[PDB]
Write a protein that binds this DNA or RNA. Sequence first.
RNA 1: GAGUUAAAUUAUAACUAAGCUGUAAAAAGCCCUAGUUAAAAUAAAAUAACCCACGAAAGUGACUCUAAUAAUCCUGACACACGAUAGCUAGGACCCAAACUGGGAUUAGAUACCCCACUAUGCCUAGCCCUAAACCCAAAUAGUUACAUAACAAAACUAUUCGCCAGAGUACUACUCGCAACUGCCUAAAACUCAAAGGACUUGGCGGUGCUUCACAUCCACCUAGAGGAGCCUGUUCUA
Lengths: 86, 208, 137, 116, 96, 66, 23
Amino acid sequence: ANHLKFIARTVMVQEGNVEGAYRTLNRILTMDGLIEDIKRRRYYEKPCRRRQRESYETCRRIYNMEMARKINFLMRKNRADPWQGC
Amino acid sequence: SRYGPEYKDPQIDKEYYRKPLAEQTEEEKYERDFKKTQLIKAAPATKTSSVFEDPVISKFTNMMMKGGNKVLARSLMTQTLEAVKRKQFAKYHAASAEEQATIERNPYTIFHQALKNCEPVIGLVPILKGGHFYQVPVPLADRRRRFLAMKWMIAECREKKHRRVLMPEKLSQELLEAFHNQGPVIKRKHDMHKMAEANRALAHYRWW
Amino acid sequence: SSFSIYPPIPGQENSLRWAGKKFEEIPIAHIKASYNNTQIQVVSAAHQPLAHASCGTEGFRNAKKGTGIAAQTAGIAAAAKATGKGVTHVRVVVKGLGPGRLSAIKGLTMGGLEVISITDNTPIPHXGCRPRKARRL
Amino acid sequence: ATPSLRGRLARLGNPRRPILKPNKPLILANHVGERRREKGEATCITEMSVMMACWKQNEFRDEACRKEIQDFFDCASRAEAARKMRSIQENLGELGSLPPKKLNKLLHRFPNKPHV
Amino acid sequence: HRFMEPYLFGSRLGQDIIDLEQTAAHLQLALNFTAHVAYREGIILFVSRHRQFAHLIETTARDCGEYAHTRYFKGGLLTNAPLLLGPGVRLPDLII
Amino acid sequence: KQRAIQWGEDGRPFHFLFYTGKQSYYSLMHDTYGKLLDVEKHHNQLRAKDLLAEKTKILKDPIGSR
Amino acid sequence: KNILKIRRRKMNHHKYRKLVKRT
RNA sequence: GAGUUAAAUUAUAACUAAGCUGUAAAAAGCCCUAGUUAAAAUAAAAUAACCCACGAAAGUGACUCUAAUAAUCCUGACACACGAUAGCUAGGACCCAAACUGGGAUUAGAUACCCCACUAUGCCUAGCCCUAAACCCAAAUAGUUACAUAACAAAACUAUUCGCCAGAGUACUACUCGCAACUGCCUAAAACUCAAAGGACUUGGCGGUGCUUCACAUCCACCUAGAGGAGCCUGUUCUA
Ligand SMILES: [K+]
Ligand SMILES: [K+]
Ligand SMILES: [K+]
Ligand SMILES: [Mg+2]
Ligand SMILES: [Mg+2]
Ligand SMILES: [Mg+2]
Ligand SMILES: [Mg+2]
Ligand SMILES: [Mg+2]
Ligand SMILES: [Mg+2]
Ligand SMILES: [Mg+2]
Ligand SMILES: [Mg+2]
Ligand SMILES: [Mg+2]
Ligand SMILES: [Mg+2]
Ligand SMILES: [Mg+2]
Ligand SMILES: [Mg+2]
Ligand SMILES: [Mg+2]
Ligand SMILES: [Mg+2]
Ligand SMILES: [Mg+2]
Ligand SMILES: [Mg+2]
Ligand SMILES: [Mg+2]
Ligand SMILES: [Mg+2]
Ligand SMILES: [Mg+2]
Ligand SMILES: [Mg+2]
Ligand SMILES: [Mg+2]
Ligand SMILES: [Mg+2]
Ligand SMILES: [Mg+2]
Ligand SMILES: [Mg+2]
Ligand SMILES: [Mg+2]
Ligand SMILES: [Mg+2]
Ligand SMILES: [Mg+2]
Ligand SMILES: [Mg+2]
Ligand SMILES: [Mg+2]
Ligand SMILES: [Mg+2]
Ligand SMILES: [Mg+2]
Ligand SMILES: [Mg+2]
Ligand SMILES: [Mg+2]
Ligand SMILES: [Mg+2]
């Protein structure tokens, strides 16, 4: 209300298309977490639920980022077996 | 089904075999048809290589058949084309110079064009959500639209016709009525469009 | 062709004029895409309203007006009324998150109106009024 | 980088109060979850709406809506072709990441060892 | 492994180094014990589930005249020998 | 067809793969793999000597080989 | 599970809070 | 303690529009309304936070300043001090959320879930009440990785010391002592009834539990011919 307008959360179209510009805006909000934040602010969650939600988000983030490393670590072991029928 | 999975649908068009040298890819298609030694089903009784048949006529003839009287269905279809031809010939004679070369005297041309105007463009299918059914419009496939047009023609001429008027003559009238975009079947097609357009906001329910 | 996503700052002087006028002179199209209705209003550079349109005013009623098609029709009607007053380019501001955000954006494009900049001004409290309780549906 | 798992879980030799209370133990399995099928959405909506405009503007007669009618048919065929081909190719296309069947075999070759 | 600590001379930049002095003492008894059981007409089986030397080990036993098993090991082979192999089977007297 | 006796009077198995459960199948696999190495070794020697006197005879389509 | 004991104590306390209110 | 306000919202004003809110779908409510621009007070503290710090616990994470976090570093009550939230007494504040209550809808009924309005109250100052799944269900101080897997879970154990525990139901109850409590808190039995109550696990069944896949007379979408309507034939029930 006090800041200047048409600076924050604003994109400009190029070559006359609007679908592409809108998707760029959505990626900006999704990366910054505003899209999920608006979803959670439609209703009110008690502080008991908020901590229970962050204890599940953090656990998923640890497991997903640890399984991902093992996948990349073992990714090179997918070539054709040189000792088939050995 | 006495035919196994290896059997395929035979090709009936004679012209497909008489001029194969003008194309190369199509030559590879049928040269491998027997080179793979794939079995071929027996020729159907209804379909024949006669140049005077038409696939749309056979399907329409089959639908009119009740029980197993193919001869009676063929007889009714023969008279209906004759009945249309007589009416068109009579109207041609009583016409002016500019009106003479407007009237079509080909029953096959009329029959093909009549069905292409009675086919609905967008249909309806009930969808259950929230314990209630909502009529959700869908882009019906071409085969369904072609089938639905034939069924409407048969249903109309069987129900609301008088007892005295014969079947071949009553169906002949509707073919001319549909050829001019004024038959009751065209009205029924528009009625289905009326309901589909009214429920245009419910198209989001469908998931395909 | 160097194109910058960021808007031209009014303090600087950018030689990028649409229809002979600067960036700030171009009218504004406010879009409020709620969860049950979509309201579209176009205002001039001096914040003077030109035309107003919404799903309710276009004949849609009750749950129907909350669908995307209802917002799409409103954008076409709003652009048609706006184009009558002689506006070519407009800066669209999107308010809130709802099912009608995409439809209203392309509704103006197909209505004879051209957009050049997109702004999202969803009300985001920073700690604010306590919202309603949850729904145990 | 992986979030630190130091002084998080509730253990006897932990002075800090618990920060994480997992539903199930954080032990790596020998298999990954299957891919989730993408939920469908209504297709040919931007083309149906313009078709309805011509019908309402011409007493529901396709005498002048031929351009809109054909596009609606074209969209239906285009949507039909894409719908009846996504399932077969997506299994082996893999988007650069091996299908779940191949990853399960790869993990079995290098299993995790909770015991001993 | 915890039980390999006494047999490790040390660790070099995170890589363990096996003390060959203890290896020589153990290998001396291993070869001595292997020869004696072969002297007394004993059955020796070579077992190695590794898919890089399976052919080399399998050929090694053929030259020595002994038996080798570098393939998949069935569950009830050595324990439930009568059912797996035959009615009367003489079990191997040494496994390598 | 009946299996022959697999051991002598002293109990020593005749074949060197009797303790693998399937001596006949694995012996065939061992010989088949050994032939591949010999072909690879022979081909390696031929490549060293710069001679290619062999041809691919796998294609037996007119005979109808399966 | 232990819920079979909390529910038993739940009913007794609930019935006790109605005996006090009635009398 | 003292001072301060970014983002949102509302009183309020201008302009345009006739509708606005709401749901799986509606009704009710509003039309003193809605959108945009301008804008106090009260209340609550996006991202940082994938960080794990401070306090004895309950707790604390918008900014600034002041004061400030016991013990030369064991255990210890019924004694002293403290103790979320709800609730009480008096004064002040009230955007917004909201038990109770009223209306709408659903249902056989709905004094429930869903929708709309509004009160206590959530807030500030002073006093009281002293209860929680106050649970990390794991007491404090020193240690060991030796011995050794009931089960499950968060591996096993030694030394000093305090508190607590003697079948289940009756029972966070009756009686009694203290309390700013008076529908209260703390302390806490018996008569009588039963031969069990209870912890963990295994297989099976089931699930209006989730994920993936599938119904070629098949559940839906969809095709054809029929039953239920009438007479007649025949078979049951009832009547006889
Ligand atoms: K804040
Ligand atoms: K089971
Ligand atoms: K009957
Ligand atoms: Mg402000
Ligand atoms: Mg601490
Ligand atoms: Mg648990
Ligand atoms: Mg009881
Ligand atoms: Mg006020
Ligand atoms: Mg009303
Ligand atoms: Mg207002
Ligand atoms: Mg914390
Ligand atoms: Mg302390
Ligand atoms: Mg201290
Ligand atoms: Mg002390
Ligand atoms: Mg208190
Ligand atoms: Mg309180
Ligand atoms: Mg209070
Ligand atoms: Mg009182
Ligand atoms: Mg008060
Ligand atoms: Mg109030
Ligand atoms: Mg309120
Ligand atoms: Mg009521
Ligand atoms: Mg707590
Ligand atoms: Mg306790
Ligand atoms: Mg404790
Ligand atoms: Mg203590
Ligand atoms: Mg201490
Ligand atoms: Mg300790
Ligand atoms: Mg005891
Ligand atoms: Mg007792
Ligand atoms: Mg109590
Ligand atoms: Mg009591
Ligand atoms: Mg007493
Ligand atoms: Mg059936
Ligand atoms: Mg009959
Ligand atoms: Mg009957
Ligand atoms: Mg009868």
